């Protein structure tokens, strides 16, 4: 996938290691990193303007 793009990388707080943590309760993670919950108990990190789940 080229640069200048978005990367998709597939408990109350879920942390990302290489960055941020996503709070599912109030659903809170500017715009560089985002956390999306495509399913139930499934999280994917999205990185705009181009990794471990903890």
């Amino acid at each position, epitope marked *: 996938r080229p640069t200048r793009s978005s990367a998709e990388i597939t408990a109350f707080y879920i942390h990302w290691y290489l960055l941020l943590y996503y709070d599912v309760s109030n*659903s809170k993670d500017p*715009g560089k990193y985002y956390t999306h919950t495509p399913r139930r108990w499934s999280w994917i990190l999205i990185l705009r303007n181009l990794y471990y789940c903890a």
Partner: T-cell receptor
Amino acid sequence: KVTQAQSSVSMPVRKAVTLNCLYETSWWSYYIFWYKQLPSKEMIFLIRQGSDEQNAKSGRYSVNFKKAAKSVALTISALQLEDSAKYFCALGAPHTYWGISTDLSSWDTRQMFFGTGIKLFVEP
Amino acid sequence: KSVTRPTRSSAEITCDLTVINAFYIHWYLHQEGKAPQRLLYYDVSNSKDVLESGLSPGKYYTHTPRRWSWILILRNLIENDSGVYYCATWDRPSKLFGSGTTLVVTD
């Protein structure tokens, strides 16, 4: 702002129905778009009528644009059965570079302001 | 064309806008009784989200799954968030609209 006061108008097939849409604007030059939202919710573009253009026509579709009255009402002539939809009068300023606020937006970031729509029933 | 998601969840809106040279992708919400209204537009080149005034960040996100592809993501869904969502991009004679997906938010 767009004001479509009348909704759910009914007209027979083969007649002509005029959908009255108004607008409120502070733009020197602008365009008014007539879309139809199908039952599949597929918003289909029908006609484009500029503020500084002659009353637009697209075959069956026509516009009776009144710049001073801000009446850009659409008219559909010789309706067929597959004409019933929710007709939206939308005020936008896409291809306009002068006459809007001092924002640095490049008109590709400009929103198409919609009226609440008018459903048209094509009775037989 | 339909996306059913519970409250306090995340919903995705993908659409068939095949525009290649698009620079901005607007996301309109038609709530079936009001006018179709923009929630945001996505600056494709700089990849930014411009929300309408009075909103809060993180309510809406625009994802780029592929090259010329966009998805509107809603966090902490509420019932008011239900409606129809369109991806709209300005075209030369008009504003092209996606097929539009209905997001219904269940209890």
